[PDB]
Amino acid sequence: RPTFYRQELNKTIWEVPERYQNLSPVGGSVCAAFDTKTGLRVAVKKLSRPFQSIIHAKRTYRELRLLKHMKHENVIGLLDVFTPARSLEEFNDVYLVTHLMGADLNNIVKLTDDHVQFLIYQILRGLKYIHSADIIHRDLKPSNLAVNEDCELKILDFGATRWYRAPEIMLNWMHYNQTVDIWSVGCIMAELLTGRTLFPGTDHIDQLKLILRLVGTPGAELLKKISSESARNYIQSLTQMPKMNFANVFIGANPLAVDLLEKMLVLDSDKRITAAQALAHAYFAQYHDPDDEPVADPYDQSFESRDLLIDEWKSLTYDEVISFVPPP
Ligand SMILES: Cc1ccc(-n2nc(C(C)(C)C)cc2NC(=O)N[C@H]2CC[C@@H](Oc3ccc4nnc(C(C)C)n4c3)c3ccccc32)cc1
Ligand SMILES: Fc1ccc(-c2c[nH]nc2-c2ccnc(F)c2)cc1
């Protein structure tokens, strides 16, 4: 068992192995550190009172289980996970360690067409992987994309969101699909090409109106899929609007970029391009290699249907800390 040392940083106590030096805040709370074992800089997340409730306890387990599974160049992965606790009984703190990228996509974004190709290619390559595990990110946005000085990119999730959200989520459809993430990538790509927020809505109603102004009000095929009478009464009561000409709206962009945007920002989620289809789009011909775009190992999310005690979620989490094997 390693030797821990204790310090206070910003009202927060950090008790970490001596392996990790030079802790400095960035954000749970997050520190940058130096990993003396590898010579690389790391980000360390301390979970805030991980067993305060059944929902916290289940969140704690969910994040550890997801981060242990993710092994892809464009998705956050775990270098280490530790607790200063020496027994299950005393276990009350979880620390997660990953590679420090040093910036997010806002920070980058303060870009050529070639930069946009490479950045969106990497997002889609990570999303292919995630979606192959039957996971939906649900909150992709610039601040959940970590970028290093080489413009290498990883998807993560820190836990306005609404600006990149799919319209079917603003409408509160409970049966939305993976392509909510492709909507978000569309919103991000538009913002990298134009340097403006595509849909900077002030609330869920404002956000939906900005969206329908570009993509048009629902057509008949989509209206027939809407179960909610109140949702339909509302949408069909708006001034009806055609889909705009994306070629006019994004005029000046690489027409190949515009063509992909149209495939991502289709209003009916059933007609949106998937991540795997998007990687094969001609816009990524300089990056696409179907032999180097892997899918995930099977991901057991059956725990999500369970109603357990805090102590049960805690013991499961504890077993996941103990079984952790670092990457070579
Ligand atoms: C309840 C729950 C919450 C999140 C999730 N989740 N789901 C996912 C995917 C994408 C769906 C697979 C990922 C996560 N969790 C997650 O991403 N953790 C990050 C959150 C902050 C992060 O801080 C970092 C990390 C790297 C980094 N590089 N640069 C900088 C800035 C300081 C500039 N970083 C700043 C982190 C540092 C350690 C360890 C972990 C983490 C699942 C469940
Ligand atoms: F104004 C609208 C109307 C429909 C959507 C929408 C987009 N894709 N899928 C849907 C959808 C499908 C089934 N039920 C729903 F409630 C929504 C988005 C905004």
Please provide a brief summary of the model.
Keywords: Acetylation, Apoptosis, ATP-binding, Cytoplasm, Kinase, Nucleotide-binding, Nucleus, Phosphoprotein, Serine/threonine-protein kinase, Stress response, Transcription, Transcription regulation, Transferase, Ubl conjugation. With 328 residues, the protein is α+β, with helices and mostly antiparallel strands.
Taking the alpha carbons of the first and last residues, their distance comes to 20 Å
Question: How many H/I helices?
Answer: 12
CATH architecture of the domain at 103-284: Orthogonal Bundle
CATH superfamily of the domain at 103-284: Transferase(Phosphotransferase) domain 1
Share in β-strands: 5-15%
Given the C-alpha coordinates, what overall shape results?
globular
| Number of E-state strands | 10
Q: List the strand order in the largest sheet.
A: 3-4-5-7-6
Based on helices, strands and strand pairing, what is the structural class? alpha+beta
Main beta sheet: strand number and arrangement? 5 strands, antiparallel
- What order do the SSEs take from the amino end to the carboxyl end, as H and E? EEEEEHEEEHHEEHHHHHHHHH
CATH class annotation of the domain at 103-284: Mainly Alpha
- The gyration radius over C-alpha positions equals 22 Å
**What do we call the CATH topology of the domain at 103-284?**
Transferase(Phosphotransferase), domain 1
Helix content: 25-40%
Bound molecules: ligand HYW, 2-fluoro-4-[4-(4-fluorophenyl)-1H-pyrazol-3-yl]pyridine
InterPro entries: Kinase-like_dom_sf (IPR011009), MAP_kinase (IPR050117), MAP_kinase_CS (IPR003527), MAPK14 (IPR038784), MAPK_p38-like (IPR008352), Prot_kinase_dom (IPR000719), Protein_kinase_ATP_BS (IPR017441)
Pfam families: Pkinase
Organism: Homo sapiens
Enzyme class: transferase
